[PDB]
């Protein structure tokens, strides 16, 4: 459990998007005061073996934490995402909920697939019959208000 979260901060903090020095929610909320439209995760106090992330929206800033299940990492307790393997990359699977998937936008150099004049075409690139469905939003104590968040924090 803790080892999974801690091992994630090591790789997550190396990105620079992790700012360790603020408060639980106050750390994530600072993204709204500086990197507007950006979400960041802070290292929960206590033993410092846990991190919580929150985003900014027109409905209010919300913070969420990952839950360790036996040997798996998930932002909840429902195994509705066993696509990967057991004990896979802890927060990495959770990061998809806090942000978009990895894989920089760069790719060698040449456009493996050009998209010039090509009408009547199914825009399905990375979707070979595989989609765990992702989305981050706040619940109105009764109404699920879906919010789309996917912006990395870049210092400043």
């Amino acid at each position: 459990e803790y080892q999974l979260v801690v091992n994630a901060v090591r790789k997550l903090q190396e990105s620079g998007f992790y700012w360790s020095a603020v408060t639980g929610g106050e750390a994530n909320l600072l993204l709204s005061a500086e990197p507007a439209g950006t979400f960041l995760i802070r290292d929960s106090s206590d033993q410092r073996h846990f991190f919580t992330l929150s985003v900014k929206t027109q409905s209010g800033t919300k913070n969420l934490r990952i839950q360790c299940e036996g040997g798996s990492f998930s932002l909840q307790s429902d195994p509705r995402s066993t696509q990967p393997v057991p004990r896979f990359d802890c927060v990495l699977k959770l990061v998809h909920h806090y942000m978009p998937p990895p894989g920089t936008p760069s790719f060698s150099l040449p456009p493996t697939e050009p998209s010039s004049e090509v009408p009547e075409q199914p825009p399905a690139q990375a979707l070979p019959g595989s989609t765990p469905k992702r989305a981050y939003y706040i619940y109105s104590g009764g109404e699920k208000i879906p919010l789309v968040l996917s912006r990395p924090l870049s210092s400043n």
Binding site: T23, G24, G25, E26, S44, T52, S54, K62, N63, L64, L75, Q76, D78, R80, H97, K133, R134, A135, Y136, Y137, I138, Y139, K144, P146
Partner: peptide, 15 residues
């Protein structure tokens, strides 16, 4: 409130 601040709920539970 100077104390409880890291409050929240969850995101897209299931469907």
């Amino acid at each position: 409130s100077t104390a409880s601040t890291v409050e929240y709920s969850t995101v897209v539970h299931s469907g």
